[PDB]
Design a binder for these strands. Structure first.
Length: 148
DNA sequence: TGCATCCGACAGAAAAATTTTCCTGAATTTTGTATAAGTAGCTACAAAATTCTCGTATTAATGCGTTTTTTGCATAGAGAATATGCGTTTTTTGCA
């Protein structure tokens, strides 16, 4: 397997064209439930990690109502408000377009125990990485990953 | 001319009559006798074929010493796996 996590950005959330977490610029995870923080997919490991990442800052992951579609992540936040999961590395990109200029932030992430941030993880077999394409590039892509 | 009554055993003798059988024409269960035509086959003849055989020529068949080659051979690395390991963790004990 060669377990290999290129990096583990630390989680924040979607604040908004009106968020008061776009007032309250940080994101612990109470500050989520403060507005309608819908959690993502119970069962999908993606949230298993987020369960921490919303579950140790005055909040417990509330997988109430997630439409399981980014389009909808925006089709009620294009009204301006609604808030759910966009992690750190693209939480360079939470503040974007002219409905919305948003409050960025770092991880509150009391959830950690041992090592616990969600991890970008290229993991491989030599056969798989036995050629210039993936092997060197897959390495470079797991390498040239800036905040940009 | 109108009221009752009644009806619709036996025997002999000669002639006929059904079958039977040999004689006599009639023209068939048919089948018999010679001559001349004609219908079909036999003897003979034609040969250039075709094809059988011996010799030569090319070619395809068959074996090998060697080209590379495939597949079996060994020993070198790696990537966790597997200790120590604290160090952290879960287990286990007595008081209120």
């Amino acid at each position: 397997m060669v377990v290999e996590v290129l990096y583990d950005e630390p989680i924040e959330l979607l604040t908004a064209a009106n968020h008061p977490l776009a007032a309250y610029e940080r994101v612990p995870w109470s500050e989520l439930v403060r507005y309608p923080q819908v959690v993502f997919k119970d069962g999908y490991g993606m949230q298993r990690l987020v369960q921490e990442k919303f579950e140790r800052l005055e909040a417990t992951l509330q997988a109430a109502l997630e439409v399981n579609t980014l389009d909808a992540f925006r089709g009620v936040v294009r009204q301006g408000e609604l808030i759910a999961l966009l992690p750190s590395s693209a939480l360079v990109e939470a503040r974007l377009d002219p409905t919305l200029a948003v409050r960025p932030l770092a991880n509150s992430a009391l959830p950690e125990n041992s090592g616990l941030t969600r991890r970008v993880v290229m993991v491989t077999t030599q056969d798989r990485l036995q050629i210039p394409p993936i092997k060197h590039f897959w390495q470079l892509v797991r390498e040239n990953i800036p905040p940009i």
